[PDB]
Structures are given as C-alpha cells and as structure tokens.
Design a protein around this nucleic acid. Structure first.
Lengths: 58, 113, 108, 134, 205
RNA sequence: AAGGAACUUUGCAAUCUCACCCCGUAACUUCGGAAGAAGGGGUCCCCACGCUUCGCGUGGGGCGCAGUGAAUAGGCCCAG
RNA sequence: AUUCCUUGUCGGGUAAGUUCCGACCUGCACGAAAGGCGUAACGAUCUGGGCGCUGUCUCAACGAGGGACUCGGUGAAAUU
RNA sequence: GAUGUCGGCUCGUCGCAUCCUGGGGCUGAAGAAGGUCCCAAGGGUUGGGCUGUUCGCCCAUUAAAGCGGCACGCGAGCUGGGUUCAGAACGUCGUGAGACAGUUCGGUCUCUAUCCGCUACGGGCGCAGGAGAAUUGAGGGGAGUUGCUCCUAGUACGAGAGGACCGGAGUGAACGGACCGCUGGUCUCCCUGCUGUCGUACCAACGGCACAUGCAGGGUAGCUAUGUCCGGAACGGAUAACCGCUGAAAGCAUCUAAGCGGGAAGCCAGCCCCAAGAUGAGUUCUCCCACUGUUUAUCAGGUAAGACUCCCGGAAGACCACCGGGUUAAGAGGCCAGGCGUGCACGCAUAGCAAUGUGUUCAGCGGACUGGUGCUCAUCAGUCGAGGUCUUGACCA
C-alpha cells in the first residue's frame, strides 16, 4: 500500500519547530530618483518607466 | 561536475528553434520582452548573428539565411541594421530586467537592439 | 582560486618550445619514419617504420602522428610524438589524396 | 589487455592455432626456471606476460593437440603498449607464443612481428625467431 | 618545513633525456613575509607568507594595518608554515632544488554531490536480471534488531571533492627561476588557477 | 578502449541478423517438406547501347567511410 | 517429466560438468488403448550444446531527455 | 487484530578456538622444506566449471586461498533459483474425492520516510565590545597487505644433492588518492558526408522531419579509465609470547620477590584529513572607538570600523553555502587576434555529352580554450552594524 507512514501526529509544537524558516524576506524597495516612488533596485521603475531615461512606455 | 557552457530546458532541436524564433523578432522589432533568462540566452546568438550579416557579400547573406527563415527580416538585418553597427565593435544589444510577472511568478525583462 | 593576473597560455608555451620539433609536411599518404632503437643492451639499433599516416592529433610538445603498417601478415600502428627523442627524421614518400583528417576507415 | 575467456592467435608452429586464456599468471620468468606468480590476482595480461591457456584449435599433425592445457606468453596485444619515449604500439590482433617451463617456445619459429617488450621480459629465445621486433 | 605558495598552471610533455615525462607546471610566485610567529608570542614557531597581489582599493582597513605592520603590500592570501624563517621574502630559488621530492598540496576539484559507486566505489548491482536498484544505490545499511541503527561512518552519497589533499614525493624536475616557475612530475591537486602549496617531503624514503 | 557470457537460476536483457534480386542449400522424410535451410554476391549516380515498358540487362565512367546509403525491416545451427 | 540410495557406473563434450547425450542395468515403486515403443513436419513449449553479437559481466564512463532540486499558482494520501 | 521463509547479490562490521603475512619455545630441528605449542586479529584471504544451493567435488593459481557471530546480518535494499497457494504430468497410495518421503513445466514480491540512526549542506544563538584575517590542537577519522629477482653468497650448512638466517637493493600485483599531459572513451548540433520528403517561386544555396542527434565520419574543453603520478615507510616509546644482567628467601641454583635490559604486521607517537558547540567555547596580528535620548516616549536611534541586499559570473553548488567582479571596472557576453576541430565553402572560371574533376582554397564554418579591447550589462540605492557587567588581584606616576 502506502509503505512508509508516520508513527504519530506531530505536536502543534514540533510542527512549528519546523516552520521557523518559511518567513518571507521583505523586498528591498528603493526610492526612484525621479518619480521618487519606490522601485526594485536594478529593474525599471514600474511607475515612471525610467532607468536613467524612460524605457517602458508610461 | 557540470563545467560546460550553454543553456537548455527543451531538447536539442528546440533550443535551436527558440533562439532562431526570438532571433528573428528582436531583429524584426528592435525590442521584444521575454522571460529574463531566455533573453540572456538570446543575446550572444543574435549578436554573433548580427556580426555575420556585417559582411555584405552573398556568402554572409546566405549564412544568415540559415538562421532567419523570413526573407524580409534577413534583408532588414542584411541591409538596414547590419550596415549601421559597422563603426561599433560588435556589442549592441542590451537587457533591462523589468519586474516579476503574475501567473507564474517569473521575472521578465527587455531585450532591445 | 588565487586570482593572479596571468596568461597561463604562454607560461606553458615557454615550458614547451624547449621541447617542440617541426617535421616535414605530410597529412596522409606514405611516410617513412626511420626511428632509432637505442633500447637494446647498449647496442643502439635502427628500425624504420613506414607507411600511411592516419592522424595528427596534437600541437606543441604533445603533437603527434600515427601511421598504419602491415608487418609480416599482421596490421601495425605506431604513435609518433614529433618531438620524441627516439626519432631521428621523418620523410615523405608519396603525398596522398584523401578527404578527411582520420582514415580509420582504412583499418579494414 | 588479455584475460580469461579471451582467445589469442598462436604465433608459433607449436601446432596450436588458437587458444583460450585460462589464467593470467604473473609472468614469472627469471633466475633458474620460470618463477612462481607474484600474487593470485592480476586481472589483465599485457604483452610479454605469461598466461596459462587451453588449446581450442590445434592443427592436425603437431606437438600440441586440441584440448591441451598449456602456458603461453602474449606477444601482441591489440591493446596499446606505451614505450617510455612516449610512443605507442598496437597490433591488429592479440596473439601469443606457446612455451615451456623455461620460457622456451614449443615451436621452431614465431610468425608475425613480436612486441619489443619481450626483450625486456627477458624472453630471449622467443625474440630470436621473431621475424621482427617492433 | 620549508615551502612556498604557488598557482597550478597546467601539465604538458617534457623529455628528460629520452624518457618523456608529464609535468605539472606550477608557478610559485615570490612570496612575501608578513608575520613571524614565535613560540614566545603565539606560543609556537611558524611564518606567514603571502601570495597573489591585491589592489589597495579592495584592502579592508584592518587588513592594511596587518600588512602595513611589515610594509609588504596587501596580498589576498596568507598561509602559515611551521618551523621556517629566511630573511626578506620567500621565493623558490635556492628553496627547492632540481631533484628534490616534494608534497604538492592543492584543493581537490569539487565533484558536487556524488553517489556511492562514485564516491566510495561500491558496486551497485545488476542491470538486467531483475531490478529497480539498477546499478547505483547502496545495498543494505546494516543488520537487524542488533545495532538497531547504522554505524557512524557508513559510506553513502555525499559531497565529494573540495577537500584538502596531499600527493607526496614528487620529483621537482625543472626549475625556472626568473619566472617563479617550477615543474613537477606527476599530477598536483585541484585545477589550474588553484592555490597549491609545495613543501619539503613530509617524510620521504 | 581491451575482452567477449568470464554475468547468471537460465546470454533474462540488449545487440548482431534484418528488404528485394542472383548463385548456393544437409541430416532426416509420410517425398509434400525440412529451406529464408547453412553460405556467398549484388543494390548509388552519369552516359551509350539493346530490351516488353514503369522498369531492366550489358559496357564504360563517376563520388563517399558507407549506396534497401534516412524509416519500416528473420540472429543461425547441433542434440533431446 | 516415472529412481529412494545417487552427483550409480563407464563413455561423451568441457581446462574443470550434481545438469545434458549414449550405454549398461540393481526397473526403491515402466509396460502395452488410465495405450507400449517409434516418428517427417509443426511449438511465444521444456532441457543441454555451439557459431555469431553484444555493457550480461570484467568495472564502469561520457552524453541526451523526463522526474528528483529552486521560485510563483492550486494542493492530497496511508498513518496517528 | 502478522517477529516475511532457503539461497544469491549489495553493503558491511565483530570474536578468536589465526588461513597468510609479524615474533617466539621445543623438534626426532644439519640447510633448505616442515611438525608442534606459545603471543599475536593490522591488514589481506583470487578467477572459473557442476548444483537453487549452503556445502562440497573439480580447473588454474595464490602468501593465503581461516572458522564463526551480527533475528542461520542485510526483501520499507534487489533478485526470487529454492520451498510450505490456484493449473498440468509421471511414479507411488487410495474403491473414490484426494494424497505424497517424491519428482516435473508455470505461477502479479506494495511510487510517497514522521521519530532515532546515517551521509552531506545551511539558518539561529552562543563564546562579556563591534569587526577583518592568520592559527594552536583537546580530541577524532583515514591508512595499516603481499609476492618475485638481484646482491651479500653459490657463503654458513651439507658425504653430496641441494643451499640459507641477518642485512642491502630493486621490480610487480591488488587496494586507495589525486590527476587528464599521454593513450583511449564521450562529447545530442562544434565541422562534414549521405537518403526520403515538405518548404524557402524556380535553378543553385539552405532549413524541417524521419529520437527524445534521421544516418554516417571525426572532434576542442569538460568529465572520464583500461591512462598517468604518488602512497602503505623510517625512526621512536611502551609491551606479548619468548631470551636475559645483578640476585636473596632455600650458605648452592634461580629472568625475581628490591632492581635493571632485549623483544612482535599488534598498542601509543609518527603520515594524510577533520577539529574549540574542546558552552572549560583558546591563541595572534589589524581596524572602529567612546555618540544621542528632561525622573512625560525607561531603551532604542544617527553611525565608525565592517558587512549583508542586489547585479554579472565561477574550475563552488541541489538550495543554501563558497570564490570573483560590480566604471577609481577587463567580471561575463560581444568584439579582434590567436589556438584547436572539421577538410576545402558560396560564387565564378575552366574540363567534360553528363556524373563529377580542377582552380580561386592549407579554403569556409566554428561550443566551451590563450590573450587584448571599455562595444553591452554589472546603474541607482537601501539594510543591518560598536560604546564594552561586576568582584578580587597585580602594575602606573
């Protein structure tokens, strides 16, 4: 059948002991030089469309 | 180990169709956006390829035809775009990663001539 | 690992131009390498393998050529290091007209 | 290399034509007679190595008959013996020379070239019938 | 004891007389002396040499002081050697002598995560007479209700390579001072561009 | 690579063989078969020539490692 | 394929054969339509041998692709 | 309300009543070769044929080709030949249905690992400042095998035949490590050749598909062995059996009760590798330094040294981690040059009825390899990160 199987329910505790590593990492938003709106370093500012000049249409 | 140098994700005859498939477009549009990585792959192939065109003689014209099956595009590359990068030391094509997408969480990017 | 600036490319060449010898032309077709069999006792012999060339794998200290011969009813192939001390001189005998840098196709 | 179950050509008139290997003895020629193997392992016979064999085809009329268990001394491995100058030799077929407990060919002559490595192995007489010693 | 740092560079062919010999061309650049440890300061005798150079624009502030503490010029690599000395800076000239046997010690090329057939040889099994354990996969990890576990060290897949290594007694064939180049017979560890350390025989015949 | 059943409960498995012309083909037999027994040769292109035409035969010529040149496509035998 | 003693005995083939073929016979417990013995041809049948070929093996190696791993979406199971 | 069964294969590890190597007593031990008892498990202990075998017989070797233990070690590891399902046969028993000390052909052995354990690899925190880097070694792991030839010496020995110890040289085997220069393997589009078909209008030149490379030939780097290189050591300390010096109790004798020495592949040190979470958390060199916050916001907040984030890579790698660069730049792509593989390109000309050949052409094409070059991208910027407890003691004017 389902050959390997668990020997007990894991504590709500232990089940957590585990998860202490799934905590997201909040992006490192940076403030655009022009639109002054926050962008993602190294990419195009989704708001103004700039990256030293304006690449992406408005 | 794995100390080679190239990228795949399809078979062999595909990673060949793609690069030709995008190769044209970029040459036909000057800019196309695409998954970040596929751009990165794409880059050098179009450049070499542009550098091929940069000869003007039939031969060169005919080598390109191998990787540009749309008559028009090849002429564009052959007569419009190739004659222009003359002065520069081959190396024009840039990429500007944009931002993550939605249905797959993949970061896109722009590859422009 | 260390990141010193360097053209390992040439560093090698130097330690390899002290040990690199040039030989006639040839690509295929007959040869007659008249080598030396200094190997016997003290008595230094003189053999002369000779016949078709079927490969030039290499460049520099490692460059070499392979020749096929049928000695006394049984095929024989020798791998010669251009710069191999046991060799005195090589000589053509008849340029060959073939169509590929191998020939193995001839091992039958 | 040569190994058990691997058939060789015979390069002598011992009468034997083809022979199957049986065991790679650690070719012990030296001193008085042939010396006793130097190990019970050793999996490959490299030219100028001695092996025990079994005749699978001997010719009619000849000192050696079909089925006779005999020792031989590999003289041509289709492998590739690498000479110290860095040269390489490889023959089209594997072939050995039947012999006797003193390292002597049961034949009156060798046919085909013989590995020059045999002179090294001290197999003098064998060498002495060799039309060539590549 | 003695010893100097170097960079692997590659192997090639070379004849010493009439016997061709493969050789690993190592470059043991001149090495600086940046700290003399003494069984009176660090409780033990030893030295600190340096190797590749480094632009000062990369050189941390603290690191500068340490190097400046001897007025050497930021290297980028430092390594100790026990019971050594000399005066000035360490090169291979006079250090190693044509004929000496040595122990080259680089870092094995890293093989990533390797099975047992590859990391410990093992033998896996079949390939045709029944299976699912075709070739690799280890056989059995242990016994039964006895040692109801597995032993400490049982060989199993793992990261193979990227380990320090030492190939003893190598014959320094040639030695091209004026180029901190040296040529050793045989193969040295790790790949070209790698840091290799050459010492005197750890203990030789 | 070298070797070639040394594997193994057993060459299981996977190769080889693999089309169509031509030559050739054993024991044994209820003479029908065994037989595609076994074994060997051919097979592409050009041109002339003759043929029952698609096609084919003959002669010369040509190119390659290789010509049912890629897909389909018997491994054979001895003995019970 | 009917044998206990048993791998019977001699021969055969093998370098070496508790299996295989041939005899002999002492048929533990063959036998004549619960058919006896034989038999060309036929078998995805069962046994033993051989030629050929091979990664079955000596030892494994490299390469491909699909999982296995990472991130975005959806998100089970047996068990306890 | 289930402790899966014989045998293999894989993977091992342990005991010694040691199979071989080590040391020793006695021998009816001349020498060589042996017998036998003691001490001694470091390491090693071959490949074939027959059998489901274990066993054993045998072929050829070997220093040897040990015996046992670990649920007759190991099926959540594989097989399944064996035997304790359903089919069928023979002999045998049974009037029969069926049976069997028996024999014989056939017969689905279950993707998903939670806890311990194990192999690798990270995150936290800790180690009384915050950081960069170099180390000591507590302890721990790996390895620990053997033949043959030569020399001494044709000696000692022996009627002779034959023929050593000790010591010193070499050269293999198997086993491990590292490595890819060599010799080979591979190299899934790096070059070419070839077929059928569809398309690029056609001719010519090409592309697609005939694997998930249509086939073939070859092949750089990488990885790789059947290829290379190196190793198992020496000395030392303490000992086993065993041999002994001085020597009483037994005015002698005694390796012993005082004492002292020799002495094994074994033990400890030595070799290579790990290693202070060696929470008893060590040592050394270097850097940043003493900010701000009204008993209403009691500790956080600017920041230093430094580092992460992120970008572009890597001989690093599953992810993390690790190394390198990030314009005061040569990190990677490109680009030029070169190397190396393929093996002479398109086109044109000429020869030929044509197939094709010849020339221009050692052409053309080009993955990863050596360099050079600011052409392209590594922009901009953010986040985190010190002010050093107390007690005793010592030294400073």
């Amino acid at each position: 059948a389902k050959h390997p199987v668990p020997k007990k329910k894991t504590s709500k505790s232990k089940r957590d002991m585990r998860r202490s590593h799934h905590a997201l990492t909040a992006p490192n938003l940076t403030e655009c030089p022009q639109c002054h709106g926050k962008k993602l370093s190294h990419h195009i500012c989704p708001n103004c469309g700039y990256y030293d000049g304006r690449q992406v249409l408005a | 180990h794995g100390k080679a140098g190239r990228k795949l994700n399809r078979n062999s005859s595909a990673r060949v169709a793609l690069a030709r498939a995008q190769a044209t477009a970029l040459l036909r549009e000057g800019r196309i956006q695409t998954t970040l990585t596929k751009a990165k792959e794409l880059r050098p192939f179009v450049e070499q390829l542009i550098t091929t065109a940069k000869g003007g003689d039939l031969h060169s014209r005919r080598l390109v035809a191998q990787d540009i099956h749309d008559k028009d595009v090849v002429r564009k590359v052959m007569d419009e775009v190739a004659p222009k990068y003359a002065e520069r030391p081959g190396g024009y094509t840039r990429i500007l990663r944009v931002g993550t997408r939605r249905g797959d969480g993949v970061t896109m990017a722009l590859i422009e001539l | 690992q260390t990141h010193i600036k360097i053209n390992r490319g040439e560093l090698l060449r130097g330690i390899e131009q002290d040990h690199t010898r040039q030989l006639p032309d040839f690509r295929p077709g007959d040869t007659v390498r008249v080598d030396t069999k200094v190997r016997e006792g003290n008595r230094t012999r003189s053999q002369a393998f000779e016949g078709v060339v079927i490969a030039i794998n290499g460049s520099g200290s490692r460059k070499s050529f392979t020749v096929r011969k049928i000695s006394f009813g049984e095929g024989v192939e020798r791998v010669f290091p251009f710069a191999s001390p046991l060799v005195n001189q090589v000589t053509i005998v008849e340029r060959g007209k073939v169509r590929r840098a191998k020939l193995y196709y001839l091992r039958e | 290399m040569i190994m058990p179950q691997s058939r060789l050509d015979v390069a002598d008139n011992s009468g034997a034509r083809e022979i199957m290997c049986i065991r790679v003895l650690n070719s012990g020629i030296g001193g008085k007679g042939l010396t006793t193997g130097g190990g019970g392992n050793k999996r490959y016979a490299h030219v100028g190595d001695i092996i025990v064999a079994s005749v699978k085809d001997a010719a009619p009329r000849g000192a050696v008959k079909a089925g006779d268990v005999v020792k031989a001394v590999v003289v041509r491995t289709s492998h590739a013996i690498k000479r110290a100058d860095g040269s390489t030799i490889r023959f089209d077929r594997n072939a050995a020379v039947i012999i006797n407990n003193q390292g002597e060919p049961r034949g009156t002559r060798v046919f085909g070239p013989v590995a020059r490595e045999l002179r090294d192995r001290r197999f003098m007489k064998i060498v002495s019938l060799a039309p060539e010693v590549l | 004891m003695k010893g100097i740092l170097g960079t692997k560079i590659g192997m090639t062919q070379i004849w010493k007389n009439d016997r061709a010999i493969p050789v690993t061309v190592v470059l043991a650049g001149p090495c600086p002396i940046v700290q003399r440890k003494t069984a009176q300061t660090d409780g033990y005798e030893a030295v600190q040499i340096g190797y590749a150079p480094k632009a000062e624009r990369k050189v941390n502030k603290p690191m500068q002081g340490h190097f400046a503490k001897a007025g050497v010029a930021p290297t980028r690599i430092l390594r100790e050697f026990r019971g050594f000395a000399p005066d000035g800076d360490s090169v291979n000239v006079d250090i190693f002598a044509e004929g000496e046997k040595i122990d080259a010690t680089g870092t094995s090329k890293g093989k990533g995560t390797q099975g047992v057939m590859k990391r410990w040889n093992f033998a896996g099994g079949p390939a045709s007479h029944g299976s699912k354990k075709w070739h690799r996969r280890p056989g059995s990890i242990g016994q039964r209700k006895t040692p109801g576990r597995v032993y400490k060290g049982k060989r199993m897949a793992g990261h193979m390579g990227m380990e320090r290594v030492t190939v003893q007694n190598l014959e320094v064939v040639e030695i091209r001072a004026g180029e901190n180049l040296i040529l050793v017979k045989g193969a040295i560890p790790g790949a070209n561009g790698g840091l290799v350390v050459l010492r005197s025989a750890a203990k030789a015949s």
